[PDB]
Design a protein around this nucleic acid. Structure first.
Ligand SMILES: [Cl-]
Length: 346
RNA sequence: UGUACAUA
């Protein structure tokens, strides 16, 4: 009987099994639930460098079969860890040619991510050179975008310029990505980690179709990232557009969170623009702020106003709202809405 | 009273 069946049979009868006993059995061990667990704990607990190197020729030899196995991918990942550094380069050579494929696969993509987490920049670049061939499809992929996000988080900004130039490959790409459940994560990481040199054309593209992206289920998270990570002029352009169209932005499901984000990240003079738009006369109608507390989404925006502004800015909101407090008591949740405001009408 | 990602 092969060593694995023997081992799975009576685990405790084999308590002196070592990695150098595995030899040819590596591939079957690594694809086995029990066997892969054995290798893993051996690789982590052993303080013998030569035991650890023993199975490595087999890992390399079977790399293609292992990287996308439910149990083998962990064995390959062990050799991308710190302290196995002496192996990173030849492990990378064993998987390099199929990186374009591995990036899309649910198990192999975890190997690519661990490698990007650990290896030195020259090897990170070698892996990115393969990603380049499939980058656009990769960014919209449930698995592919995790490798792209990891690249952006771990590689020097200058070596992911090809990812930014993909976001800019054609007019509608930034829009296409920002409204993708996976592409939007890529745009966010770019806003977090790229140089302002690199993010400015990207943010520019986002501004051109701002209204659409801001009210999208995924784009609203991209605009929020622009608010937190773009420039002062970006925040200014956004607040200004938000204030001129305050009621339409606040009464929609996704764009309402964008106003909340302006209130949380804005300087005092941006907050003032939003308070002023909300307390504006409009002779022939209730002030905007009052209409906003009657609304399923906008009522959270008004609450965020009251909590994020100065007492001086709150004064105007209190004076504008207070007449209308009884009428607002009627509509559904209208009670509970001013409940959480009774601390400012005390 | 209101929004988003992959393993045993
Ligand atoms: Cl354009």
């Amino acid at each position: 009987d092969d060593l694995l069946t023997r081992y799975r049979a009576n685990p405790a009868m084999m308590k002196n099994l070592k990695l150098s006993d595995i030899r040819g059995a590596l591939l079957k061990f690594a694809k086995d639930q029990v066997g892969s667990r054995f290798i893993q704990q051996e690789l982590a607990s052993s303080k013998d460098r030569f035991e650890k190197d023993s199975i490595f020729d087999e890992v390399v030899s079977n790399a293609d079969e292992l990287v996308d196995d439910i149990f083998g991918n962990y064995v390959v990942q062990k050799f991308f860890e710190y302290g196995e550094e002496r192996h990173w380069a030849r492990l990378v050579d064993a998987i390099i040619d199929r990186v374009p494929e591995y990036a899309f696969q649910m198990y192999a993509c975890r190997v690519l991510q661990k490698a990007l987490e650990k290896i030195n920049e020259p090897l990170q670049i070698k892996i990115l050179s393969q990603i380049r061939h499939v980058i656009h499809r990769c960014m919209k992929d449930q698995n592919g975008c995790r490798v792209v996000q990891k690249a952006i988080e771990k590689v020097s900004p200058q070596y992911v310029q090809f990812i930014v130039d993909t976001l800019l490959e054609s007019s509608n790409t930034i829009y296409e990505m920002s409204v993708d459940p996976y592409g939007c994560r890529v745009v966010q990481r770019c806003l977090e980690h790229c140089s302002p040199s690199q993010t400015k054309p990207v943010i520019g593209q986002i501004h051109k179709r701002f209204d659409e992206i801001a009210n999208n289920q995924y784009g609203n998270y991209v605009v929020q990232h622009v608010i937190e990570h773009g420039s002062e002029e970006d925040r200014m352009v956004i607040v200004t557009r938000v204030s001129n169209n305050l009621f339409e932005f606040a009464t929609h499901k996704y764009s309402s969170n964008v106003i909340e984000k302006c209130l949380e990240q804005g300087a005092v003079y941006h907050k003032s623009m939003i308070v002023g738009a909300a307390c504006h006369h409009q002779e022939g109608s209730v002030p905007i702020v009052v209409q906003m507390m009657k609304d399923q989404y906008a009522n959270y925006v008004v609450q965020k106003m009251f909590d994020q502004v100065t007492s001086e800015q709150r004064r105007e909101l209190i004076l504008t709202v207070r007449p209308h407090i009884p009428v607002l008591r009627q509509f559904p949740h209208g009670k509970h809405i001013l409940a959480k405001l009774e601390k400012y009408f005390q």
